[PDB]
């Protein structure tokens, strides 16, 4: 039932790193209104319109004191991650 | 420049509904989210509803919750707000207001407001 | 629930004067306070968000600061076209929530 948060408002916390278990975790800051949604999404390069990005977290989101941790997996190549309009890429083994 | 034309209000009895639309120019409606704000006669400001620039995310103030829904047309840069079962207190000028961003406050524009009177 | 309650209620002061308009809330809101004018038969206009950053057009003599749960609007050369009610709103928590509006008047 929460909102999803402002696209326009995401940093990086913890850029897109290798986990140690197979996974990609990260960490966005957001500075808008509070609570809401994470929209998080990845796409693999060339491919736009098909979402890559598989949560292990699947319902993130910024809490009046607290959230911003996101892990996924990604398939192999060249990917990019976006949170809202914030985004890195991630090459995926 | 940004403009936006409130229309819709006017006298409608307790009990029944009441649609207002708010017509947008002069800028990209489709990337910004919309709200919805009221101001009783001499009385001070009173959000109503969001809805984001998507139109996936909506939300209401508890004085309306159940009653109202906010809706919008991005091919038509239009915005709506449904007011059902409206009562002797939602009587207000209504303003629609832009967001800068994609959802949240605040305003950074205002339409002219349309004045909605609920009376028998 | 997030309580804004703006202070004073009413303030005169001369023109040419300087006015100071407070705004409390009943937890932190950081930085994400707003500051709307509207005067009279008129829609409200944006003055000031992100606590201190001034919108575009309005002029240099208005400013604000503050953050956490203390806010405040000065116009530090108050004009005849100054004259209006004066709002703050807290946009940190949904819902976003106004407060109840300072009016500020011509001494005289």
């Known amino acids: 039932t929460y909102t999803m948060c402002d696209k326009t408002k995401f940093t990086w916390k913890r850029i897109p790193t290798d986990s140690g278990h197979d996974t990609v975790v990260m960490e966005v800051a957001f500075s808008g209104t509070k609570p809401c949604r994470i929209p998080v999404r990845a796409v693999a390069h060339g491919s736009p319109d098909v979402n890559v990005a598989m949560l292990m977290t699947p319902n993130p989101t910024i809490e009046n004191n607290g959230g911003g941790f996101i892990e996924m997996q990604l398939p192999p190549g060249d990917n990019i991650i976006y949170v809202g309009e914030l985004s890195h890429q991630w090459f995926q083994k | 420049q940004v403009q936006l034309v409130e229309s819709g209000g006017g006298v409608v009895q307790p009990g029944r509904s009441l649609r207002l639309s708010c017509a947008a120019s002069?800028?990209?409606?489709?990337?910004?989210?919309m709200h919805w704000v009221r101001q009783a006669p001499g009385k001070g400001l009173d959000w109503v509803a969001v809805?984001?620039?998507?139109?996936?995310?909506?939300s209401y103030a508890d004085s309306v919750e159940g009653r109202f829904t906010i809706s919008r047309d991005n091919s038509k840069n239009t915005l709506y707000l449904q007011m059902n079962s409206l009562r002797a207190e939602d009587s207000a000028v209504y303003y629609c207001?832009?967001?800068?961003?994609?959802?949240?406050?605040?305003?950074?524009?205002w339409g002219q407001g349309t004045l909605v009177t609920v009376s028998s | 629930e997030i309580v804004m309650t703006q202070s004073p209620a009413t303030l005169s002061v001369s023109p040419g004067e300087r006015a100071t308009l407070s705004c409390w809330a009943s937890?932190?809101?950081?930085?994400?306070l707003a500051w709307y004018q509207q005067k009279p038969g008129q829609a409200p206009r944006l003055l000031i968000y992100?606590?201190?950053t001034r919108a575009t057009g309005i002029p240099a003599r208005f400013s604000a600061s503050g953050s956490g749960t203390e806010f405040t609007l000065t116009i530090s050369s108050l004009q005849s076209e100054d004259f209006a009610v004066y709002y703050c709103?807290?946009?940190?928590?949904?819902?976003?929530?106004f407060g109840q509006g300072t009016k500020v008047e011509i001494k005289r």
């Open positions: 207001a832009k967001s800068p961003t994609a959802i949240d406050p605040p305003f950074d524009y």
């Open positions: 002069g800028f990209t409606f489709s990337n910004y989210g």
């Open positions: 809805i984001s620039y998507d139109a996936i995310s909506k």
């Open positions: 937890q932190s809101v950081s930085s994400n």
């Open positions: 992100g606590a201190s």
């Open positions: 709103q807290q946009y940190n928590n949904w819902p976003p929530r």
